[PDB]
Amino acid sequence: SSFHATTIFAVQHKGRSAMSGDGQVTFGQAVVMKHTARKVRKLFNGKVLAGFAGSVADAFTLFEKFEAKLEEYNGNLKRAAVELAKEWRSDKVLRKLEAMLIVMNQDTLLLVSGTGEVIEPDDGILAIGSGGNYALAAGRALKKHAGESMSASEIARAALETAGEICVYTNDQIILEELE
Amino acid sequence: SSFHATTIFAVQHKGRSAMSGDGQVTFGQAVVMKHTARKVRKLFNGKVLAGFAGSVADAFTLFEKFEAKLEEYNGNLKRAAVELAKEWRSDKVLRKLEAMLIVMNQDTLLLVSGTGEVIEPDDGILAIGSGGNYALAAGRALKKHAGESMSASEIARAALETAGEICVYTNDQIILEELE
Amino acid sequence: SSFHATTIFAVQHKGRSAMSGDGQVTFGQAVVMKHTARKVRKLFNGKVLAGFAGSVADAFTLFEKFEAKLEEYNGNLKRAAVELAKEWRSDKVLRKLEAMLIVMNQDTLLLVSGTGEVIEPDDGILAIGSGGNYALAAGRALKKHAGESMSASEIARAALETAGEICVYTNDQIILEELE
Amino acid sequence: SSFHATTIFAVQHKGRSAMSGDGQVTFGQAVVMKHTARKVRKLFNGKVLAGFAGSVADAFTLFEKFEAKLEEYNGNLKRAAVELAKEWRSDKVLRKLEAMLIVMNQDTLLLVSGTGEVIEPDDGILAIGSGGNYALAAGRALKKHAGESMSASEIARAALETAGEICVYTNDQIILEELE
Amino acid sequence: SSFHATTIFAVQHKGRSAMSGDGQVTFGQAVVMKHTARKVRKLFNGKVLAGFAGSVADAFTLFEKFEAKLEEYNGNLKRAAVELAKEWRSDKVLRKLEAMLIVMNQDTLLLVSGTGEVIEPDDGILAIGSGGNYALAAGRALKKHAGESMSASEIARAALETAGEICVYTNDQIILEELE
Amino acid sequence: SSFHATTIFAVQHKGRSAMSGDGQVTFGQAVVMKHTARKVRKLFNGKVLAGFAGSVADAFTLFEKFEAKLEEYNGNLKRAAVELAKEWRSDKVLRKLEAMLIVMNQDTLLLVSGTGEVIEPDDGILAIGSGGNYALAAGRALKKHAGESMSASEIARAALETAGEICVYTNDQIILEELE
Amino acid sequence: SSFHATTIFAVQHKGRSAMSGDGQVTFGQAVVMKHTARKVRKLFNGKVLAGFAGSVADAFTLFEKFEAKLEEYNGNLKRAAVELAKEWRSDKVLRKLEAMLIVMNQDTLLLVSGTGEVIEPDDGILAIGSGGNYALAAGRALKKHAGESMSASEIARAALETAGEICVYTNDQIILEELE
Amino acid sequence: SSFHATTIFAVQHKGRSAMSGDGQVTFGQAVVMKHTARKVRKLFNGKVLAGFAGSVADAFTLFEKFEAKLEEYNGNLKRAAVELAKEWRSDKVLRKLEAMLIVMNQDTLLLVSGTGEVIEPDDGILAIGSGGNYALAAGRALKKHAGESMSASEIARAALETAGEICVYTNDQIILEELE
Amino acid sequence: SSFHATTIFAVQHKGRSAMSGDGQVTFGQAVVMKHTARKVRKLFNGKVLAGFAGSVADAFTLFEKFEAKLEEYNGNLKRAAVELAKEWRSDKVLRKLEAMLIVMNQDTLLLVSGTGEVIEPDDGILAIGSGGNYALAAGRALKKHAGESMSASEIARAALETAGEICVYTNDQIILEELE
Amino acid sequence: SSFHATTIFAVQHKGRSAMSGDGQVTFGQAVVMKHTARKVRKLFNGKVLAGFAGSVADAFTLFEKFEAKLEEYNGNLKRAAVELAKEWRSDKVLRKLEAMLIVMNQDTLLLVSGTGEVIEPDDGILAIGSGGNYALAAGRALKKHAGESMSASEIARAALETAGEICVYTNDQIILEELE
Amino acid sequence: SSFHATTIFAVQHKGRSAMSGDGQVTFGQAVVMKHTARKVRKLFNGKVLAGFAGSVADAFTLFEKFEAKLEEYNGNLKRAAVELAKEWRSDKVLRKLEAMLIVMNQDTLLLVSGTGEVIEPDDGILAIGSGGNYALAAGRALKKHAGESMSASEIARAALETAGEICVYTNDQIILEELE
């Protein structure tokens, strides 16, 4: 069989911008090889958060094509988001690729898919990978519910946390990133 | 094809005991026939909450065998929980049956399965049916997070709410039940 | 292969109560054997409308069990609806059976299923068999939009009409029934 | 799994020409990621309406090839329709592509398919994406029945409306477009 | 593998009543064991034609249950048709049974199915077994077309004839039956 | 799913040469998008009838390669028939292509297949697409049977007619073509 | 579905060398389109017999490559046999191809396969296509038993004959060929 | 989907006899409902250890039949082991059942299976449920290597420990049992 | 069928660095062809250990690309690890390839996958091929428990040992390697 | 998954009568639970050898029904062989049963199958279970080849031996039985 | 379907070097086309035995690439073995290829696989194709057992012999080769 997605969660609340992801590398059906991996990077002079879901070749790889194209247009996510899609959708080797890409900036927030989708969350919460939905369900849940009572940073941390709790493919060691 | 599960969520917080479920009846792949159904009943002189997931024949049906056996032992869920399992696990017609049964009392809380399982949630949250997990992920999420800030009743309401929001098979019209 | 469901449509608007169904008997993949069949009967001194979907054995058969139990409780659809569910859900031969049952009265309106479901449409339109949805779509659509502009009888007629238009399994010759 | 088609509906009644589509982005089995998206664009100095179904790469992408070839022949839809078919049908990457294209003009109206089909509705209603039929059913149904009673704009709106009602893959927020 | 259906064709034109069937026994995928078999019998003092499709146990077997029930009601096909369905639909061993039963009388004409269907051809042509459709397509074809120019008897003969000509599972040696 | 074949029927009787086809565009399982389409063209100074089955890109497309190669040999169907096969059989994009091509001339008559077959009907009747066989069964049926009593033109018309009558994927609006 | 192989049979007895094949063109599951086709040709100044099985493109096509390489080595079947194998086995389009090739000369006798096999029958009977074995069975059987009693020509004829008898895919009209 | 086995491990080293099992109740694909469950019981005046794997109905249920037959023969595991096999293997409801049974005594040690197997480990380690092997691997491994260095109790504990490490279906909270 | 992975195990304890793998070559379902093979090589002036899993072509092959890129950056595993990933992940022929690569150095330790993953075990044990987990289970288990009590070399040896015990795909003859 | 067959080999040479079988209990795909099991018993005052293949419930179970019926006829294997078949073939629970039964006497030798076969080896060698064929291939091999050079007893021993050597599901610890 | 492997057996005993293979060409499921074929060749001035398994195109083909590369290194099997693997593993057309290659020399002995394996039998016996295992089981069997009592040459002969005896896809006519 294959390696399982990592779970990754981005959220944007009261103008803080945040991305949490697990470390759990779940190989095969059931086996776990590692308990920690970095797939949330900081891109472009800490201006963007991007987490990928996938293999660190694929991972690294996409990332730069997002860079390249971010410079290639001086800060416009949406634009570069797109022009990557095009690039990803077309490339033989990545077009087939399963996972997605979470990109966000100071302002705004994007799902970006092997398949050439690019998605914009109405409510400032995006989420990918194994437990995705579970954390999505945590995210949206908290924001709606203890927006005032908690933070950006915090809400995301927690997303993941809940995930690992319902979710076999998600684990307690969380990486956390925010912009300034 | 078949009718989809309803989603139902029970939770027990700061000694309030609560069960929310959607109404959405999703027939076939995609079609929706109704937007309201009662599958959360009050059982045994408002002493127990029980929601089922399923068909109201099956529904009604199980319910009474839980009654019958609740009287048959003067208030002991666990006991009756079990002795139903036995009964359900064995019966030709219900043993095959898909969904589960959420039963709770003043005190405590149980999953009860066609298959003769009976389950006890460490953290006082149980959840069944379509969006289950999504609401489970809301439940556990809130409790952990705005326990103080919100209620029994409330937390459950909301579970469902979030569900319908991620979940195609779950819908906004929620039934709510609590004991005293 | 098997014979295809017939399409049947019931609706209830400004106090008239109505059931339209096609005649198309579509055998096998593609073949059509007949262009007319009656599966909408009048039941219980023209007090109820019921159409079934299925085989006229199964058809006849269910119908009487719904009779028997309608008398068995002096006009209560819902009640008898149910008690049929029970009976159908249990029976070896009818439990497995595919199609559902539309039953409505002066007052009110029910889906009733081999599976032990019994369903109540918030908005007075019910629909079964091949083109079903197509006509549910038409139903639903007419009422919201030309409630004023058209009738019970007429709205039902049309549903089917539109069905046979999109749907290869539904055909122009429609049986129409109403109560008084 | 994959993202679900969006539902799009075009219709043409008493000389107004109209395109409605939902916003529901339904990822995976059941999950919903967004509630709004634009895939109905205005093309060629607001002379044509076109909605696509698909991914905004694929979306964008097709659209321009339909531009390019619309100019390439000074207003002839049908012509360009075709010549696109050809181009789409051949291209490695778009040929396999799932969804279709609705293109209409002042005058007339076209389905255009990855497969090299190009389709002309006898009755001025075309329809794509998830709930499609549901809304085609509504479309078709409205026009036959409340042609008089309602408009272009309005009939299209409603289609979608009814869709989101039966259909779990279609949602209430509708984008509406007409030409002059 | 299994033995293939025989093809059988009944038709009723200008008040002559006629049933043709092939002899071809096609075993396994491709093999042919026999070239002649009688599955068209005369029943009830040459009052009825009945052909079955199937095994001559099953064959013989059904036949008598049609007899029995024909006497059991003094000439009413429809009635007995039905009451067989019931009987066939229910019996463990015949309910599963694939093929159908063509029954006709002086007057009228019926398909009768393992599944408890009973069918009435609007246009006085019925047809079962391998080439069914091909002969159905001959039948309906001729009647519509050289009604005047040909007979009952004749039209049926020919049905089969055409069948064997398009159809691998149908063969030239035809049995022919009519009533007086 | 996919668009269904159109049905098309060519026949050659008492030296008249004729091609009928339906209009029915059956999309998806059951849905119908259009009720009229031209896929029977006149080719080569009304010297040849050719109907295709398929997409009008594919359609148009094949057609010209038949033209081109018909000129390329001054009237010899068979020859050009073949040399197309070669061309079609080899081309990546059409070799996979499902449907076939009916070509006929003043004299004679050919099936021509994506797969590089080229076929010659002993009896001057060819037929493709959805109801094919049903009309084939009508064709061969009539000719054999009311050759004298009817025409080229006529026999073909009717083919289709019968088809739509047994066949869900075939519809009453027929296009008719003949040479002089 | 696809067209069915034609059955072809070659045999070599008391120094006569013989190839019989049917004419039955069996399209789709069950349908028959033609009753005659030539796929047994005479090659190389009536020095070789070869029948193919397949499509007359593929047919023609292979044949010439066997020509070309027969000249390419001045009468050596086996040699050219092979060198064809090579060529066929490699070619993208013919490698995948289903059927095989029977080639025989004055002297000797070969099976030659899309797969790069080349086969030599110990006992001078080779056989391909639908009924093949059936006729190989007949072949083989005749020679062992009425070698004396019958001929080359005759034994081959008969094979096919017997084929069309057991086999639905094989038919009575046989093409016969021998060398001098 | 279904609930996942719990992992249970028994081992027997330097005359102590030991059973460890996790608490993880893993429902569905990925979900976890509980983190604690007891399926290791003490049987027969703390004379036997037995853990089951399964549902606490099935669980309870088997257990007693092993009681009953343990008394039924005054301490002989193997005997009763068997006679249970027999009983389990035969019973309609338990025969199909998935999981196995670990039974051990002062002396000795048994696998016992729904299938009528009864197994004796040469080396005193037995193991069932989700992570099983993982822990059998750990078991086996510890004993061979740190027999001296560690205990009964301890070796068993650890097995599970290591399980929950590799295995997503196994979790940290371990129930531990030994006899005297 | 195919040849089975060989089992390979690397571990790193108290600064010794170790790789054990079996010799069992298990062809087909059940068959064993050889009992010894070398797929653990010493790389880069005995500075690295690497074992592959696979075919000695694939084996050899990968190995050198890991050489080449190890030189290509003067001792940095991780770096070269990656740059290999890239290369492997991309290459048509190696990308599809099943097995992974274990690479470790004086210092540190890597999984490297045809898929473009590159993995770092928190606890210094890595493991591939047939029995893998079994030995990972043993690995992991030994270190936690008899770290003190045993060595690098020894712990690795044993892993495999235990493997061949549970695992039919792993066998007693172990190749052992360490660096200095 | 399931437990794998044991391998068992019976052979009869120069009037010695012998049965060898492995011990290897291979659970699941790959896992091995035990290395020794007795499934070769001596029956009927050491007059018969019988090995079964299967579960020791099933095992024991069959055995006695062979006993019972052996007494029930005073020494006639064949007879009792048969009358067991009947018994086994019919019984609901054993008729489904996979493995077979090797029975032999002073004289002669029998395969006896769940399915109601009873088989007699021409050459005095029978063999069942995992490696069957491999040992069968050893058996027949030796006898043919070093009949003189080796024994009954010996040849069988060895069978198994070879098996475990090619065969993953067969292991070195062999049980051996002979009569006098 | 396809042609079945030939069986081929190489063995090396007391310094004689030997390769036996059957002739049986088993086509399709069950059919046999030929009873003799040479796929064991002598290569390189009778210095090497090589048998292939497969098609004589593929066959011949591989063979020379083994030659070429054998010269290309002056007698080193292993080396050339390998460098073929590389070549075979990579080539589009042979990499997919099923069977293997048995190569041996004066000294030593190799399996060589489409997949880029190259294998070395510990015990000087290799075997490929249909009955492989059966003869493998004979080979290993005899050597172990009547090494002294029989020869190289002999042992191999016999392998095959036994095969054809258990094995449907292996036949009595054996080709035998040895070096000097």
PDB file of N, CA, C and O in Angstrom, chain B residues 1-22:
ATOM      1  N   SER B   1     -31.160   2.709  -4.928  1.00  0.00           N
ATOM      2  CA  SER B   1     -30.390   2.821  -3.598  1.00  0.00           C
ATOM      3  C   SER B   1     -31.238   2.908  -2.248  1.00  0.00           C
ATOM      4  O   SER B   1     -32.456   2.613  -2.225  1.00  0.00           O
ATOM      5  N   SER B   2     -30.577   3.296  -1.139  1.00  0.00           N
ATOM      6  CA  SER B   2     -31.240   3.445   0.186  1.00  0.00           C
ATOM      7  C   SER B   2     -31.320   4.901   0.771  1.00  0.00           C
ATOM      8  O   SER B   2     -30.670   5.852   0.297  1.00  0.00           O
ATOM      9  N   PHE B   3     -32.172   5.015   1.793  1.00  0.00           N
ATOM     10  CA  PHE B   3     -32.312   6.180   2.656  1.00  0.00           C
ATOM     11  C   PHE B   3     -31.025   6.284   3.476  1.00  0.00           C
ATOM     12  O   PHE B   3     -30.490   5.243   3.885  1.00  0.00           O
ATOM     13  N   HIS B   4     -30.547   7.518   3.713  1.00  0.00           N
ATOM     14  CA  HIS B   4     -29.334   7.793   4.492  1.00  0.00           C
ATOM     15  C   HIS B   4     -29.681   7.936   5.935  1.00  0.00           C
ATOM     16  O   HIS B   4     -30.751   8.487   6.257  1.00  0.00           O
ATOM     17  N   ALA B   5     -28.792   7.439   6.791  1.00  0.00           N
ATOM     18  CA  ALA B   5     -28.845   7.736   8.222  1.00  0.00           C
ATOM     19  C   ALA B   5     -29.341   9.207   8.611  1.00  0.00           C
ATOM     20  O   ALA B   5     -29.207  10.147   7.790  1.00  0.00           O
ATOM     21  N   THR B   6     -29.928   9.445   9.806  1.00  0.00           N
ATOM     22  CA  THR B   6     -30.086  10.857  10.276  1.00  0.00           C
ATOM     23  C   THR B   6     -28.975  11.087  11.169  1.00  0.00           C
ATOM     24  O   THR B   6     -28.537  10.173  11.807  1.00  0.00           O
ATOM     25  N   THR B   7     -28.567  12.310  11.347  1.00  0.00           N
ATOM     26  CA  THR B   7     -27.494  12.438  12.268  1.00  0.00           C
ATOM     27  C   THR B   7     -28.021  12.758  13.661  1.00  0.00           C
ATOM     28  O   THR B   7     -29.068  13.349  13.814  1.00  0.00           O
ATOM     29  N   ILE B   8     -27.357  12.233  14.674  1.00  0.00           N
ATOM     30  CA  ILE B   8     -27.842  12.358  16.027  1.00  0.00           C
ATOM     31  C   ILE B   8     -26.683  12.429  16.921  1.00  0.00           C
ATOM     32  O   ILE B   8     -25.742  11.646  16.844  1.00  0.00           O
ATOM     33  N   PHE B   9     -26.825  13.313  17.864  1.00  0.00           N
ATOM     34  CA  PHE B   9     -25.748  13.615  18.750  1.00  0.00           C
ATOM     35  C   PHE B   9     -26.171  13.740  20.206  1.00  0.00           C
ATOM     36  O   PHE B   9     -27.019  14.559  20.591  1.00  0.00           O
ATOM     37  N   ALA B  10     -25.525  12.968  21.046  1.00  0.00           N
ATOM     38  CA  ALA B  10     -25.876  13.042  22.412  1.00  0.00           C
ATOM     39  C   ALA B  10     -24.670  13.577  23.094  1.00  0.00           C
ATOM     40  O   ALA B  10     -23.544  13.208  22.745  1.00  0.00           O
ATOM     41  N   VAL B  11     -24.892  14.471  24.051  1.00  0.00           N
ATOM     42  CA  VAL B  11     -23.816  14.846  24.987  1.00  0.00           C
ATOM     43  C   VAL B  11     -24.188  15.227  26.457  1.00  0.00           C
ATOM     44  O   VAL B  11     -25.281  15.739  26.735  1.00  0.00           O
ATOM     45  N   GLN B  12     -23.234  15.007  27.362  1.00  0.00           N
ATOM     46  CA  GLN B  12     -23.464  15.074  28.775  1.00  0.00           C
ATOM     47  C   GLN B  12     -22.438  15.977  29.406  1.00  0.00           C
ATOM     48  O   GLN B  12     -21.302  15.545  29.654  1.00  0.00           O
ATOM     49  N   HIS B  13     -22.818  17.225  29.682  1.00  0.00           N
ATOM     50  CA  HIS B  13     -21.849  18.206  30.225  1.00  0.00           C
ATOM     51  C   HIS B  13     -22.282  19.053  31.466  1.00  0.00           C
ATOM     52  O   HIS B  13     -23.356  19.734  31.443  1.00  0.00           O
ATOM     53  N   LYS B  14     -21.414  19.043  32.505  1.00  0.00           N
ATOM     54  CA  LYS B  14     -21.680  19.715  33.812  1.00  0.00           C
ATOM     55  C   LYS B  14     -23.039  19.244  34.311  1.00  0.00           C
ATOM     56  O   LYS B  14     -23.885  20.066  34.754  1.00  0.00           O
ATOM     57  N   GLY B  15     -23.234  17.927  34.165  1.00  0.00           N
ATOM     58  CA  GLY B  15     -24.421  17.257  34.630  1.00  0.00           C
ATOM     59  C   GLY B  15     -25.728  17.624  33.948  1.00  0.00           C
ATOM     60  O   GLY B  15     -26.830  17.349  34.488  1.00  0.00           O
ATOM     61  N   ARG B  16     -25.642  18.254  32.779  1.00  0.00           N
ATOM     62  CA  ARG B  16     -26.822  18.251  31.920  1.00  0.00           C
ATOM     63  C   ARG B  16     -26.696  17.182  30.805  1.00  0.00           C
ATOM     64  O   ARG B  16     -25.589  16.809  30.390  1.00  0.00           O
ATOM     65  N   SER B  17     -27.835  16.637  30.400  1.00  0.00           N
ATOM     66  CA  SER B  17     -27.840  15.483  29.548  1.00  0.00           C
ATOM     67  C   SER B  17     -28.721  15.754  28.360  1.00  0.00           C
ATOM     68  O   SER B  17     -29.919  16.011  28.514  1.00  0.00           O
ATOM     69  N   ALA B  18     -28.111  15.658  27.178  1.00  0.00           N
ATOM     70  CA  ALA B  18     -28.629  16.279  25.978  1.00  0.00           C
ATOM     71  C   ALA B  18     -28.459  15.455  24.699  1.00  0.00           C
ATOM     72  O   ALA B  18     -27.432  14.810  24.476  1.00  0.00           O
ATOM     73  N   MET B  19     -29.486  15.509  23.852  1.00  0.00           N
ATOM     74  CA  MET B  19     -29.482  14.841  22.545  1.00  0.00           C
ATOM     75  C   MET B  19     -30.090  15.674  21.394  1.00  0.00           C
ATOM     76  O   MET B  19     -31.302  15.921  21.340  1.00  0.00           O
ATOM     77  N   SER B  20     -29.232  16.103  20.476  1.00  0.00           N
ATOM     78  CA  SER B  20     -29.661  16.770  19.256  1.00  0.00           C
ATOM     79  C   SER B  20     -29.596  15.793  18.024  1.00  0.00           C
ATOM     80  O   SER B  20     -28.698  14.925  17.935  1.00  0.00           O
ATOM     81  N   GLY B  21     -30.556  15.904  17.091  1.00  0.00           N
ATOM     82  CA  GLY B  21     -30.488  15.227  15.767  1.00  0.00           C
ATOM     83  C   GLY B  21     -31.046  16.009  14.537  1.00  0.00           C
ATOM     84  O   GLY B  21     -31.927  16.837  14.688  1.00  0.00           O
ATOM     85  N   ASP B  22     -30.566  15.795  13.318  1.00  0.00           N
ATOM     86  CA  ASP B  22     -31.123  16.568  12.224  1.00  0.00           C
ATOM     87  C   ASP B  22     -32.469  15.970  11.861  1.00  0.00           C
ATOM     88  O   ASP B  22     -32.893  14.928  12.416  1.00  0.00           O
TER      89      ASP B  22
END
